[PDB]
Amino acid sequence: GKVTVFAAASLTNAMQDIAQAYKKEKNIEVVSSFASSSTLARQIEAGAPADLFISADQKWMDYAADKKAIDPATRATLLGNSLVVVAPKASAQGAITIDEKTDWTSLLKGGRLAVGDPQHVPAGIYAKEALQKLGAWETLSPKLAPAEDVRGALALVERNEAPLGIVYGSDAVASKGVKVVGTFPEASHQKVEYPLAIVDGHRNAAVSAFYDYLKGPEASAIFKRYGFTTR
Numbered sequence: 001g002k003v004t005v006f007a008a009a010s011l012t013n014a015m016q017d018i019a020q021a022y023k024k025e026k027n028i029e030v031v032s033s034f035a036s037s038s039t040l041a042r043q044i045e046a047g048a049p050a051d052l053f054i055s056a057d058q059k060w061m062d063y064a065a066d067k068k069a070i071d072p073a074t075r076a077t078l079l080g081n082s083l084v085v086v087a088p089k090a091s092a093q094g095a096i097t098i099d100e101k102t103d104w105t106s107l108l109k110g111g112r113l114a115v116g117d118p119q120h121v122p123a124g125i126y127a128k129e130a131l132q133k134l135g136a137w138e139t140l141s142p143k144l145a146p147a148e149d150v151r152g153a154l155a156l157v158e159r160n161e162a163p164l165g166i167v168y169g170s171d172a173v174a175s176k177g178v179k180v181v182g183t184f185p186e187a188s189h190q191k192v193e194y195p196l197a198i199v200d201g202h203r204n205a206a207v208s209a210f211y212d213y214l215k216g217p218e219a220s221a222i223f224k225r226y227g228f229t230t231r
């Protein structure tokens with residue numbers, strides 16, 4: 001048998017490892033299609049034969065639910081991604097406590113904070129949220145190094161060109177050139193969350209069993225290894 005998963009592309013490597021583990025354990029092929037959450041939600045809306053949908057945000061799963069394309073009795077948040085402060089691997093910077101008393105000016109060592117463009121990059125929007133809530137935005141706003149996406153903000157830090165950056169936990173794990181030096185409190189910003197649901201009409205035995213497996217120990221260990229949080 002086989003199960004077809006439409007999963008946000010940020011989950012590519014985790015999902016591929018889970019597929020190989022599930023094959024070797026249950027002898028069932030997991031077929032994954034990776035693309036943006038927007039792309040997959042519209043494909044599912046138009047009737048694509050996906051069995052499961054894992055979105056990188058609640059918004060696009062809300063969209064699929066509004067179009068009656070996913071089974072709402074099966075929807076639940078599968079993963080989180082922490083919002084983290086990263087530094088270049090070679091930096092003297094050690095891990096520090098992130099709270100209302102963090103001395104951001106001293107941590108910047110004369111440089112700028114790398115972020116996704118807070119006008120539209122989600123990691124930047126969330127960075128801005130957390131910094132405003134913690135009362136640091138007044139200090140940090142004139143000291144930003146905005147980037148076109150998370151990868152561009154990561155590149156500033158990997159090349160020692162910015163002393164700090166704000167990315168997701170899974171981005172930090174995928175980048176060998178950066179190290180986590182702090183984690184924002186989850187309530188300082190909107191939660192980064194990956195909901196999972198069975199696509200409407202696809203709640204059969206084999207789909208349901210892989211659906212359950214994604215929440216079990218083997219899949220959870222793989223997600224954590226890639227820097228996601230589990231539920």
Ligand code: MOO
Pocket residue numbers: 008009010035036037038055056057
């Ligand atoms: O899958 Mo997305 O484009 O990161 O929301």
